[PDB]
Amino acid sequence: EVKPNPLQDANLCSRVFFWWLNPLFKIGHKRRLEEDDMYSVLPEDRSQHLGEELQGFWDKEVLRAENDAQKPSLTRAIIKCYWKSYLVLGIFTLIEESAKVIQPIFLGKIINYFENYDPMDSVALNTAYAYATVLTFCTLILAILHHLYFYHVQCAGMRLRVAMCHMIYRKALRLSNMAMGKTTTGQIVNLLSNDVNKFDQVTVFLHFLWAGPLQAIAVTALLWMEIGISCLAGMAVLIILLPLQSCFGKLFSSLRSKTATFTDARIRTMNEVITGIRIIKMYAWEKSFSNLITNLRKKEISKILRSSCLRGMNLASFFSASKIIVFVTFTTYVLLGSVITASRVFVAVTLYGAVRLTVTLFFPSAIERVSEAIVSIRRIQTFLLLDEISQRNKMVHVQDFTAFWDKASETPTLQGLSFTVRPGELLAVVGPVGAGKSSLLSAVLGELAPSHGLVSVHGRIAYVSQQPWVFSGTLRSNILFGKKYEKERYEKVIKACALKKDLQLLEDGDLTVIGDRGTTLSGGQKARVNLARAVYQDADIYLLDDPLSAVDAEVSRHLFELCICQILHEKITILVTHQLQYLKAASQILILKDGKMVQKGTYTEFVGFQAYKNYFRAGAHWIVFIFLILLNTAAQVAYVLQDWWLSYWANKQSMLNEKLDLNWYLGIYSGLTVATVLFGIARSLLVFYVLVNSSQTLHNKMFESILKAPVLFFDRNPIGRILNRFSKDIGHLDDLLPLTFLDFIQTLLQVVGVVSVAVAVIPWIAIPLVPLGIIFIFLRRYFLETSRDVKRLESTTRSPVFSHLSSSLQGLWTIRAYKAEERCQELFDAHQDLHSEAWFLFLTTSRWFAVRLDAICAMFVIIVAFGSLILAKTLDAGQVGLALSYALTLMGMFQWCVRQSAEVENMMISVERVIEYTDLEKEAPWEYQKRPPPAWPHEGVIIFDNVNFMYSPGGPLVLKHLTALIKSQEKVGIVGRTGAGKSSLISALFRLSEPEGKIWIDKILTTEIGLHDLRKKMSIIPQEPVLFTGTMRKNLDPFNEHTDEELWNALQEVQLKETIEDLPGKMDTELAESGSNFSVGQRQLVCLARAILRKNQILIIDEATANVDPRTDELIQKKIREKFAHCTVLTIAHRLNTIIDSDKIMVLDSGRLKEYDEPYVLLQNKESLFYKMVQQLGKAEAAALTETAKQVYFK
């Protein structure tokens, strides 16, 4: 075996305790686990086996259904396959759910030992140990045997998930090209990614659909025997708790849905502000986007906070419902005139405890998961019933062939087509873009069926598609593509077809792994790989669609002459080509246009304590956390005292011969119930408020740091990386961490309550509770080191299986051409059961911890049950009833506590990422105490005095010693090769990084004044304009400093007025994302309007119109000269015609101011590097440039 699996050889006890898995933890404690450490899946769990199995039942179901004249039901097929195995796990559900019910009955019988206690009855003591021992076996069933069962019901979901994944991939290969229109590739991946994933969860609780209500009937029958008619008072609260949970849960969903719209609006604006952060800074618009996020955040956080009250009250109801259920029972019980006894009390408390979880959690969750599983099942059935290609389909022959991609009143896509080619004949296909193009080849493949006329083909086909598709796998396999390896032929297609030219190097040999997994090849390599695949498949019919666009022309001749011609001289070849050498080499040419055959013939016709402290001490003062701790402990103290009082009341009743003052005992009992409920909600709401206020503050600080972060930070960090902290990390802080943190500390205090009643009742239990505490701490670490690794392995192995369907579904015509559907299926199965073994580790690692984590819980129950009974003369029925009623509760709480403490830790990593972006470095303050006057650029003189510029501290000097004077209103051109420093001069002038040296503007040193004092008072037209979402008004003036008349006038000057007046909102017309409603040229017209509106005396133009069509270029250039004649203008240009008439040109080379003079005085020096750059144009317009400069300076 490749990776032996110990579960095949495991003894019954070995797999009950998951003892077979211990060596994995030995390894993962020492090393990081890798995919080679995973155990291979069991043979019955292979994706091939599971998917092939379910196809049999689904095939029969489709056959059965049509014989019955009915719709197929995939739910019937799924049941037919799995029902016989999954009902056998129902036997243990009956055994386990009756152990939940029989614990309370034997609890009562051990308590009856204390109620009737006399120390001399040795027979009674022995009988009490029998009840304690049966209570232990019931406890061990719930603790030890539950987990082997729970592993099996989880495998039943994996087997359904893996079988369905195989089925839908097998179908995905078979989809008709019409069905590939009705469905997006992203939707079919969504089946694998989201819908089939529902089947893991459905089988966890599917047995509670029957075991849930059946247990309620059993518990109510026993409560009637225990408590009589008064049991309906508690069961009413249990049952009525179901509609309230569901109804208020639906209300929570409405707020959840209304929150997301503000979240997405915020994140979209975040995407815009981060991507545009460099131009936003140069405009000094951070205050605009600051308000916009602040408003979107206040709306979002209000509904987050309001939604958190429902989740706070949901947890508060789950906490305190146990108190109300037993209150209304025992209030009714005693008012009806039955006295409180300790045995009948704590049997009832335990019976309500047993059934509350099934009624209020497992049964409604079973319904919810089965509801949305059936959604997925029918959703996938719609896909499984999509249309398919005719399932079974040397010459290829075509006459009158007429076909449609879809039937329409339009022209056919291909019509009248008539050609026929014999062994060795080659046809070139020629036409404009969209003329018919690849569709003729698609017709030979049979991807278009004949609607009229006929085609036929005999022998095998090879197909080098226009898109160079390659599957994720070894290059060797990409060439073999499901045909067997042969040394001679494979070496022939790599030696004689000299792939070695670009494969002996930069590829690590031919065993390199191609595709989405990595090593991603350029398109030219894939085309040769696809052609080499075609040569290796060595087909009789041979279709080339576009090898030649991908490879270079030098490779093209080698590729065509030495292989396509010499090897395929007898093979029936069709070649779509634009390289005329191959057109002439063809035996015939087919010319087509818009699906019409124009001409046919031969060419001869022509996380430590610091993170928790900084998370907590960010939304509440430490005085609140003192009061918050008091609410938490008071909630749990009152929770336990509500049960202690009932044992005290039972003890006080026990000594009467007279009656108890029922007003007083029932009155305090009602006060304790009110206390635990009111402290329950108060605790839960204050936690949620403090932690949601913590995310409010951490966001405000994080966002504030991002706007004031220097541009260097945005260059080092990708746009997606910064966005993820605003999308995902703060997402956790807003709506999942405060829930998990409350649920943790809510349950944590429940565990402390359970173990402190036991120590308070039996103080000796604290001695065997220190070994258990130490064991659990080591166990948790010893687990977590391996658990985090298999969690990482599992998450990493998913993306291959989704990626394989995505790329395979993109390559359907290639896959079907070679008939490699079996080979591509096996590749999916290999990826599907690489994950299935990572998921197998996920299931069994979790259950290895849980069985041990429940072993210490069951050990605690045994110590209490037997220590209460060894020390029986010390205790009394109320104390023993209390301590045992609680010990039995530990099982489900302590495992959940530990399963909500790693989620807290795994989410606090997002908090430290949010805190990381809170302490970013800041650029200089936007406004220093020294400020310019309201009229500061009075002359617009700019002086660079020995200016040095670096983009990074300690980076290479990009500007060197640059020293230049720019006179008032002077127009300065900046020219240079790429990297000469043109754009770096702007970054120095706007102080996007701090320049070394001094930049003076109007005698004011630009490094003394604030960044908004400097950046507002200079206008820039960038090369790549950004239009933000929102109104045209907000894109022209987000501060409303200008009147609508001024805005319309500026829009008229840039000729946008008519276009914008035609918009249905005029100035309040909402622009689409990035201004996609406008062309790139139009976007710069908006920027020119921005510059015109600001009326700054300094305008900087950075290669702006080089992205722009000549007519709009002429418009922008004309308007700049007209409107900014009185301004100092710095124009960086690539087209010298646009600046040849400047007053001066700064010439940059390699970051140095090589020349700075009047353009003609430059060109009058024939040795100037301006003159060289002009002569490098190679065009007579260089003379016109020289004359154009000369004619300026006489004036």
Ligand SMILES: CC(C)CCC[C@@H](C)[C@H]1CC[C@H]2[C@@H]3CC=C4C[C@@H](OC(=O)CCC(=O)O)CC[C@]4(C)[C@H]3CC[C@]12C
């Ligand atoms: C004493 C014991 C044996 C009683 C057994 C209980 C059954 C009589 C009932 C109780 C809960 C019912 C289930 C409750 C909810 C659902 C989900 C529901 O599915 C949906 O509503 C979503 C799919 C759709 O209907 O479109 C209908 C089936 C099912 C499994 C019901 C099937 C029949 C169940 C198991």
Ligand SMILES: CC(C)CCC[C@@H](C)[C@H]1CC[C@H]2[C@@H]3CC=C4C[C@@H](OC(=O)CCC(=O)O)CC[C@]4(C)[C@H]3CC[C@]12C
């Ligand atoms: C931090 C805030 C929420 C205060 C929490 C304090 C509690 C931990 C303390 C305060 C008063 C204590 C109680 C004071 C009095 C009693 C009565 C006492 O009952 C008797 O002594 C008579 C019956 C018997 O013989 O035990 C049992 C302990 C108990 C409940 C104590 C349990 C612990 C309590 C609730």
Ligand SMILES: CC(C)CCC[C@@H](C)[C@H]1CC[C@H]2[C@@H]3CC=C4C[C@@H](OC(=O)CCC(=O)O)CC[C@]4(C)[C@H]3CC[C@]12C
């Ligand atoms: C609400 C929480 C956070 C505060 C913790 C203490 C309380 C829950 C109080 C409420 C009722 C109190 C009990 C009420 C009555 C008694 C009986 C009392 O014994 C008597 O016989 C009193 C006779 C009398 O003086 O009238 C001893 C204290 C005790 C257990 C009190 C202990 C403290 C209790 C449980």
Ligand SMILES: CC(C)CCC[C@@H](C)[C@H]1CC[C@H]2[C@@H]3CC=C4C[C@@H](OC(=O)CCC(=O)O)CC[C@]4(C)[C@H]3CC[C@]12C
């Ligand atoms: C005397 C015992 C029973 C303890 C009392 C505890 C109080 C101090 C707790 C109980 C409920 C808590 C409140 C629960 C709800 C809110 C509303 C919350 O405001 C909103 O959620 C508004 C949302 C919106 O604007 O839509 C701010 C915290 C606050 C006042 C909490 C502050 C602390 C309160 C008042």
Ligand SMILES: CC(C)CCC[C@@H](C)[C@H]1CC[C@H]2[C@@H]3CC=C4C[C@@H](O)CC[C@]4(C)[C@H]3CC[C@]12C
């Ligand atoms: C398998 C199901 C029922 C859950 C597990 C409960 C099993 C372990 C329980 C259910 C009923 C129990 C029996 C009920 C009563 C008695 C009498 C007493 O002197 C103890 C032993 C004996 C004979 C019990 C043995 C254990 C027992 C069979």
Ligand SMILES: CC(C)CCC[C@@H](C)[C@H]1CC[C@H]2[C@@H]3CC=C4C[C@@H](O)CC[C@]4(C)[C@H]3CC[C@]12C
């Ligand atoms: C909430 C956390 C932080 C601390 C645990 C507080 C609660 C659970 C603890 C604190 C003091 C404990 C009480 C101390 C003494 C007694 C008397 C005993 O004869 C029965 C139990 C009883 C009544 C205990 C019940 C549990 C108790 C109230």
